[PDB]
Structures are given as C-alpha cells and as structure tokens.
Amino acid sequence: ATQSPGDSRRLSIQRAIQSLVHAAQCRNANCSLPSCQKMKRVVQHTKGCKRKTNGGCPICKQLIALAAYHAKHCQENKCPVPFCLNIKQKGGSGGGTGGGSGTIEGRGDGGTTFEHLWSSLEPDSTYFDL
Ligand SMILES: [Zn+2]
Numbered sequence: 001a002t003q004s005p006g007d008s009r010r011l012s013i014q015r016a017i018q019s020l021v022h023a024a025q026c027r028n029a030n031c032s033l034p035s036c037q038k039m040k041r042v043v044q045h046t047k048g049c050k051r052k053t054n055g056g057c058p059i060c061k062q063l064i065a066l067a068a069y070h071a072k073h074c075q076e077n078k079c080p081v082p083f084c085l086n087i088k089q090k091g092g093s094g095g096g097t098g099g100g101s102g103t104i105e106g107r108g109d110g111g112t113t114f115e116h117l118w119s120s121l122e123p124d125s126t127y128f129d130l
C-alpha cells in the first residue's frame with residue numbers, strides 16, 4: 001500500500017513537509033523541483049531570523065507548523081534541520097495556552113484542524129504553495 005486514497009489534505013501536507021525537510025539541506029545542483037527551490041527562500045530567511053523572541057515574522061511561525069510533522073517522522077534523533085530539533089526542544093504543548101479549546105469548527109475532528117492557520121497565509125503566497 002502506497003499513494004492509496006484517504007484525503008487530499010494529508011497529501012498536500014505531505015508534499016509541503018517532504019519539500020521543506022529536503023530544501024532545508026538540499027545542496028545538490030542536480031535537484032530541480034519547484035517546491036525545493038521555493039522552500040530555499042523560507043529556509044534561508046528563517047536560518048537568519050533571530051528577532052523571533054522579540055517579534056518574529058509570520059513565516060517564522062508558519063515554518064514550525066510543517067516542521068512539527070517531520071519532527072514525528074525523523075528517525076535520526078540528531079535532526080540535520082535546525083527547526084526540527086527546535087520543535088522537539090519546545091514540546092509544542094503550551095501547557096497553559098488554553099488547551100486548544102473554545103473553537104467553533106474543530107472539536108477534535110478531521111485530524112488536520114491546524115490547517116485553518118493557512119487561511120491567514122498571504123493571499124498571494126509568493127513563498128508557499130497556494
Ligand atoms: Zn533539492
């Protein structure tokens with residue numbers, strides 16, 4: 001069983017994550033993918049983003065979302081991607097942020113509820129997949 005039906009959201013998430021983990025380390029001139037080359041932009045920006053602690057940009061936050069999926073799929077405990085291990089060091093639990101409750105649509109259903117954050121992505125999304 002490979003590429004079996006389920007839901008396109010899972011696939012969209014997969015393509016984005018796969019392209020991100022790869023682009024973050026892709027040093028090969030051979031590699032030529034639209035997702036790989038666009039991801040280079042966000043990874044280069046985020047690798048230089050230190051203002052996060054004061055007031056980071058939106059890309060700084062949005063990157064961490066997809067990297068958190070790879071964080072649970074990285075077999076290597078010493079993740080080469082710097083944001084992957086950063087998520088591990090934070091847990092992402094919040095432990096007091098409101099337990100992710102009070103939503104209208106998202107009562108622990110769909111399994112990809114976080115996807116609603118893409119609704120705030122730029123309408124032009126010149127750095128991510130529209
Ligand atoms: Zn590549």
Ligand SMILES: [Zn+2]
Nearest residue numbers: 049057059060
């Ligand atoms: Zn930034």
Ligand SMILES: [Zn+2]
Nearest residue numbers: 071074079084
């Ligand atoms: Zn990893």
